[PDB]
mmCIF file of N, CA and C in Angstrom:
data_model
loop_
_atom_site.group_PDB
_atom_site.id
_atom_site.type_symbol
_atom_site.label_atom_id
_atom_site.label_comp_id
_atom_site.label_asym_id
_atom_site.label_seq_id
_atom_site.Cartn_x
_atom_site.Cartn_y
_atom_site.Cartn_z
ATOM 1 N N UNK O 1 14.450 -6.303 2.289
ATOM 2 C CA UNK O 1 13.868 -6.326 0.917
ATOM 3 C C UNK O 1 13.363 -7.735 0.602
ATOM 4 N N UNK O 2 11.652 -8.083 0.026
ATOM 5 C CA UNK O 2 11.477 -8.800 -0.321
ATOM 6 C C UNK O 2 11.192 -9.362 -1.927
ATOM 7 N N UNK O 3 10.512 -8.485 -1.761
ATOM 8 C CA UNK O 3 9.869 -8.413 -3.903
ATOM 9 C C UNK O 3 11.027 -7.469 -4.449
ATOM 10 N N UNK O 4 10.595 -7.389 -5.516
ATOM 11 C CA UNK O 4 11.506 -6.570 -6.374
ATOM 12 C C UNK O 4 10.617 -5.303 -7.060
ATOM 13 N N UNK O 5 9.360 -4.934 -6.574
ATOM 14 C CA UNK O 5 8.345 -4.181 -6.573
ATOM 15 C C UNK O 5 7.845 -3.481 -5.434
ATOM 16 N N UNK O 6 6.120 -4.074 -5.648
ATOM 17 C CA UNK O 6 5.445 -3.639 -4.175
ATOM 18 C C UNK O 6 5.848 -3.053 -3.116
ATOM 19 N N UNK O 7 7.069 -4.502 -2.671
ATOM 20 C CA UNK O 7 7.534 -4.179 -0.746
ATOM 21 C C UNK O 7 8.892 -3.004 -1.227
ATOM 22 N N UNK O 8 9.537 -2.382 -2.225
ATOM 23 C CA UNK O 8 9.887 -1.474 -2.357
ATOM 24 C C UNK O 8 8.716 -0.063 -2.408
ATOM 25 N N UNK O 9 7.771 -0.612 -2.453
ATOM 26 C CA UNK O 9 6.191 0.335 -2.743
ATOM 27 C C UNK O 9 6.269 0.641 -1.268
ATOM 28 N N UNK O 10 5.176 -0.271 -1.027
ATOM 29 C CA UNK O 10 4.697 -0.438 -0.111
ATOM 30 C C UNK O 10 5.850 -0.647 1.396
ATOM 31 N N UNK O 11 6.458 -1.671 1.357
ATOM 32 C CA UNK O 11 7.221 -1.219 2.180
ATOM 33 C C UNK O 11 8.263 0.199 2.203
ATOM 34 N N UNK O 12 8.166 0.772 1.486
ATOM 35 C CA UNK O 12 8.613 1.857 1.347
ATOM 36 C C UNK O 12 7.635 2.685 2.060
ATOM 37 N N UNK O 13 6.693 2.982 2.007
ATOM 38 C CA UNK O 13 5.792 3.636 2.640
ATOM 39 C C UNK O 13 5.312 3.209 4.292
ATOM 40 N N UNK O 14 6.068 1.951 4.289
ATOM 41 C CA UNK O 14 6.437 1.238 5.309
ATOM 42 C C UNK O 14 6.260 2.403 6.803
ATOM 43 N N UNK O 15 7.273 3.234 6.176
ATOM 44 C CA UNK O 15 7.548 4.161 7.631
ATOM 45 C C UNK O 15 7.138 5.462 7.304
ATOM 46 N N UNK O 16 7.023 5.787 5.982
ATOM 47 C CA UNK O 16 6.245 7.381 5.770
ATOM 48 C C UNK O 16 4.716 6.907 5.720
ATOM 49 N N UNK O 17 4.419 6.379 6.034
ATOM 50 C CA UNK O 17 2.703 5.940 6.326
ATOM 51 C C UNK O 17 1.981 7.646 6.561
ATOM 52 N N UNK O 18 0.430 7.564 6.360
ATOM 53 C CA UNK O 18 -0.045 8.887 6.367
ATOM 54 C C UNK O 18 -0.778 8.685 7.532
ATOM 55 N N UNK O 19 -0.774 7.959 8.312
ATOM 56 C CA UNK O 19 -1.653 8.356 9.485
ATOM 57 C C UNK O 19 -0.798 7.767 10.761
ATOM 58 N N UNK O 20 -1.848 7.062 12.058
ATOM 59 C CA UNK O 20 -1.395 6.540 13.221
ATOM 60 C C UNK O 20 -1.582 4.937 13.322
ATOM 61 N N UNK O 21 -0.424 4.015 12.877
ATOM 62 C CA UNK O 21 -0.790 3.013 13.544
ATOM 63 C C UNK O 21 -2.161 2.349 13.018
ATOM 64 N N UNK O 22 -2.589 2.387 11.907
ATOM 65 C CA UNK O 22 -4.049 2.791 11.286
ATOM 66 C C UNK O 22 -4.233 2.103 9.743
ATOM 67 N N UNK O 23 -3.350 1.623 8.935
ATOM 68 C CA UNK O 23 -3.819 1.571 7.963
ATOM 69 C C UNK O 23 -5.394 1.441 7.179
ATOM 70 N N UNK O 24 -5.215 -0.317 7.905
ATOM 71 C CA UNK O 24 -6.479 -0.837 6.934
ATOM 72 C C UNK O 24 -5.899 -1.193 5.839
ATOM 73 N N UNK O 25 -5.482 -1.549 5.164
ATOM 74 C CA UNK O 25 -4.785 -1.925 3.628
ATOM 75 C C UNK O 25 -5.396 -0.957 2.756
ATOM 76 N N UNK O 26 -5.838 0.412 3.653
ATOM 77 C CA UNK O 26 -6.457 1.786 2.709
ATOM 78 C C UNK O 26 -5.169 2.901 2.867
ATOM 79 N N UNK O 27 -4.541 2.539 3.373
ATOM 80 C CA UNK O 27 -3.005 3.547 3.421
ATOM 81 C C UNK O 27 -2.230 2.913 3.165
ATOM 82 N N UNK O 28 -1.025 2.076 3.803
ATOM 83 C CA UNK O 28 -0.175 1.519 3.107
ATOM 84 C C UNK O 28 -0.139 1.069 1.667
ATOM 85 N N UNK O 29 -1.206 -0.057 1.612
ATOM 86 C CA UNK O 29 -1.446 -0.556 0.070
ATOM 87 C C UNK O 29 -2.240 0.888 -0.791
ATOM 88 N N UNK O 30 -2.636 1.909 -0.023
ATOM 89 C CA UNK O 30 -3.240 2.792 -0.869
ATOM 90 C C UNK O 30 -1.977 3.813 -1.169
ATOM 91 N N UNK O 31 -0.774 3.799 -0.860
ATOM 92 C CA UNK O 31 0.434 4.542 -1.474
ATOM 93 C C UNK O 31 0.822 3.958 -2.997
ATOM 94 N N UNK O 32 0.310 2.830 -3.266
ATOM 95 C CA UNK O 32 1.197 2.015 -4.591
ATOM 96 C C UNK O 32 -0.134 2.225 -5.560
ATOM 97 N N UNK O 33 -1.145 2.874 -5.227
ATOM 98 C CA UNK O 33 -2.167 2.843 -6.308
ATOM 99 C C UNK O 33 -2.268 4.674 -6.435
ATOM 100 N N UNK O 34 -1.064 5.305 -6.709
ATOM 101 C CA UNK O 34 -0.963 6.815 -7.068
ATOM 102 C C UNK O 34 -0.415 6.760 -8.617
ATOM 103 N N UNK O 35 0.288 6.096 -9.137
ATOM 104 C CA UNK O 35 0.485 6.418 -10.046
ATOM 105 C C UNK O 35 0.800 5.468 -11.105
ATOM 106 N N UNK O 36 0.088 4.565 -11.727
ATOM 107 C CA UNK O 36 0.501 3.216 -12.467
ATOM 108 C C UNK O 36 0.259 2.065 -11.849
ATOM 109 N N UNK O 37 -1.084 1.911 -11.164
ATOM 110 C CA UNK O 37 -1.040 1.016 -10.042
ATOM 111 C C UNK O 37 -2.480 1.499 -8.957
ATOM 112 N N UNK O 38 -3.516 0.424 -8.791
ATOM 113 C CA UNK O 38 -4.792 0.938 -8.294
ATOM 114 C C UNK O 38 -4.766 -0.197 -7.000
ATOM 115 N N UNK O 39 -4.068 -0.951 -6.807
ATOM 116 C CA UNK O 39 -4.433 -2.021 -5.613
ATOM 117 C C UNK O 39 -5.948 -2.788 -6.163
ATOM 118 N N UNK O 40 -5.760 -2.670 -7.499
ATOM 119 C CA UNK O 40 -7.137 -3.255 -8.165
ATOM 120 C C UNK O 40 -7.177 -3.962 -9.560
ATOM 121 N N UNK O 41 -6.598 -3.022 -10.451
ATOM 122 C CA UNK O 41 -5.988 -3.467 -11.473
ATOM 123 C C UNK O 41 -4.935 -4.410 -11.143
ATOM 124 N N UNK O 42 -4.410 -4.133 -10.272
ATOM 125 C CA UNK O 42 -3.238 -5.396 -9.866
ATOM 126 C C UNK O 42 -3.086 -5.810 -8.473
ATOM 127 N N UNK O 43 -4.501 -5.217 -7.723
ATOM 128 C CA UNK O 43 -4.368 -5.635 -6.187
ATOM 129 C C UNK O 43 -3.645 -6.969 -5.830
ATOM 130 N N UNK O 44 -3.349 -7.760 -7.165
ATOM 131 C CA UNK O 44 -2.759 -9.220 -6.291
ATOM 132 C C UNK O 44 -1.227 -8.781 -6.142
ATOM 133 N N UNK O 45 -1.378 -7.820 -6.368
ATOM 134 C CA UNK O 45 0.621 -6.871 -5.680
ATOM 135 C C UNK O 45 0.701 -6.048 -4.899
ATOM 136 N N UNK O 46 -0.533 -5.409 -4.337
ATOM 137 C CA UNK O 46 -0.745 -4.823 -3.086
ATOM 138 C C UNK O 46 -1.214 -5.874 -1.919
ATOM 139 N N UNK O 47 -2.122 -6.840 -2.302
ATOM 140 C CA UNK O 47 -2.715 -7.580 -0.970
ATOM 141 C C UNK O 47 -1.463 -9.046 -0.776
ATOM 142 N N UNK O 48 -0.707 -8.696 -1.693
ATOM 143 C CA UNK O 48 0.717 -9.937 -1.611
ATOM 144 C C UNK O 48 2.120 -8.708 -0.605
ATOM 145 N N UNK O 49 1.754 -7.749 -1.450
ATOM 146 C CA UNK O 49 3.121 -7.334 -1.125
ATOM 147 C C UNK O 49 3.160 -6.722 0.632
ATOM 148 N N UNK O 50 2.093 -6.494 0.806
ATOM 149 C CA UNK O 50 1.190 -5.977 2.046
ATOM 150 C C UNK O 50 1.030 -7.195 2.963
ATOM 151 N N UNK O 51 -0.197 -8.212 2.284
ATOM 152 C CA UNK O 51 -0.274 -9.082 2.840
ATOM 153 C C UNK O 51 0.709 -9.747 3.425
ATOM 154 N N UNK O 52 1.729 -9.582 2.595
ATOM 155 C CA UNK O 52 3.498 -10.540 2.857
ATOM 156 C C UNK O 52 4.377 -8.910 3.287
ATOM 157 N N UNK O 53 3.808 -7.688 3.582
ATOM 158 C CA UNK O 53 4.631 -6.744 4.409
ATOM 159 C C UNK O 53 4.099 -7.006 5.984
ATOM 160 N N UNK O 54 3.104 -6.295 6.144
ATOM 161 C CA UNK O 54 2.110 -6.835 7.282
ATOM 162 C C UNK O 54 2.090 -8.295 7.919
ATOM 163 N N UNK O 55 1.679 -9.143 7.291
ATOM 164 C CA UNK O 55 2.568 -10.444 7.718
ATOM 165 C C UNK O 55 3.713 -11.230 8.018
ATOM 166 N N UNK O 56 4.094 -10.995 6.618
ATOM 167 C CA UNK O 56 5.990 -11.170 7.101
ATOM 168 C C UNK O 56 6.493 -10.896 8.128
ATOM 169 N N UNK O 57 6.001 -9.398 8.773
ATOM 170 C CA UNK O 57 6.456 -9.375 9.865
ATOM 171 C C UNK O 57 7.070 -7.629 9.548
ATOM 172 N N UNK O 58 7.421 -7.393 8.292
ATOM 173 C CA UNK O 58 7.761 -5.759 8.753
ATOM 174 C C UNK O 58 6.729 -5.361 9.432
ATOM 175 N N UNK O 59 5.693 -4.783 8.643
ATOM 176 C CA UNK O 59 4.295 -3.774 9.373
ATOM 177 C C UNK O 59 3.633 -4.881 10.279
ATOM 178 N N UNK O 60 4.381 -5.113 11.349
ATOM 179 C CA UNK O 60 3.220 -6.329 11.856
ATOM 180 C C UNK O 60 1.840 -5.698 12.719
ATOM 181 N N UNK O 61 1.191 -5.872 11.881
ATOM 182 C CA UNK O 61 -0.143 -5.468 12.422
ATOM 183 C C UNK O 61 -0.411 -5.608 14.199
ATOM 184 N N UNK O 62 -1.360 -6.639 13.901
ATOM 185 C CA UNK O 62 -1.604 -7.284 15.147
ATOM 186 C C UNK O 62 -2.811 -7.925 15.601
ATOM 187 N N UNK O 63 -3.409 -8.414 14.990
ATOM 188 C CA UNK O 63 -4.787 -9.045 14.626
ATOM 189 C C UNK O 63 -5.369 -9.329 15.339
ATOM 190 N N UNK O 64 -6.152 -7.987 15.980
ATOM 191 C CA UNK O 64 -6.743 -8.450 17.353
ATOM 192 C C UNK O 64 -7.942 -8.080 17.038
ATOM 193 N N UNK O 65 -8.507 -7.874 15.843
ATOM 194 C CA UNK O 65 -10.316 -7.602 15.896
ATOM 195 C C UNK O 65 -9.975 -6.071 15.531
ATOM 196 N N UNK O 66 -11.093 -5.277 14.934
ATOM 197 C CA UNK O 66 -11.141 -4.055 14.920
ATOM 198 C C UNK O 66 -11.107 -3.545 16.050
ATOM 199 N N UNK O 67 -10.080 -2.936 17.048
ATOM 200 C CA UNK O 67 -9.487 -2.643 18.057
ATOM 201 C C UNK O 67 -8.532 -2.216 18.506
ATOM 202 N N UNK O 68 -7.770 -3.255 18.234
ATOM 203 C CA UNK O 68 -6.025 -3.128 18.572
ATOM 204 C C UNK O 68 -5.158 -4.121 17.548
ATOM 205 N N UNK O 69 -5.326 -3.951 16.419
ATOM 206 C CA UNK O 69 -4.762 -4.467 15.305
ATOM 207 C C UNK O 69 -4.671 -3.375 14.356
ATOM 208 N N UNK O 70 -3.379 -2.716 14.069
ATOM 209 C CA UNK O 70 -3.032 -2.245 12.870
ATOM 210 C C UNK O 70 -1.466 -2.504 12.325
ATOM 211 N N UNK O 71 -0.311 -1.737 12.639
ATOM 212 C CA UNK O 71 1.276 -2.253 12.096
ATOM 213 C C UNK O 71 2.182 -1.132 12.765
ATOM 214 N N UNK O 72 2.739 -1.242 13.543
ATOM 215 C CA UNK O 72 3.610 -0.351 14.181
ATOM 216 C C UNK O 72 4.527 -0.689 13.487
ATOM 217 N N UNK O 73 5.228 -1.237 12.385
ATOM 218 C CA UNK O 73 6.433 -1.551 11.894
ATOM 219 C C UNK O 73 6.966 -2.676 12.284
ATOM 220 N N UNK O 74 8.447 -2.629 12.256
ATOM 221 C CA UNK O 74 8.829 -4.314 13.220
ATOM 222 C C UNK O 74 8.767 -3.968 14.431
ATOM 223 N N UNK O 75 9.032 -5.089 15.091
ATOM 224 C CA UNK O 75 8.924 -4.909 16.683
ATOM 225 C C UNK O 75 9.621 -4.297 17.353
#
């Protein structure tokens, strides 16, 4: 647990993700903009909580170019 929000959001969705290995910050961060919450109106709590899920190191992506970069979770 990091935030006291979002990464309960978002990392919450952490592992029920809707697709493969795939986000894009259009699935993960797009779970916290369903209901009180657009990743727009307050995207600086999706691209933080994301940015700092995905980075931090839970969803670690993998930043290899549109290719072989998305978030298998932790390692």
């Amino acid at each position: 647990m990091a935030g006291p929000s979002v990464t309960e959001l978002i990392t919450k969705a952490v592992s029920a993700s809707k697709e493969r290995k795939g986000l894009s910050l259009a699935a993960l961060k797009k779970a916290l903009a369903a209901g009180g919450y657009d990743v727009e109106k307050n995207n600086s709590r999706i691209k933080l909580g994301l940015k700092s899920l995905v980075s931090k190191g839970t969803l670690v992506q993998t930043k290899g170019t549109g290719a072989s970069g998305s978030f298998r979770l932790s390692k």
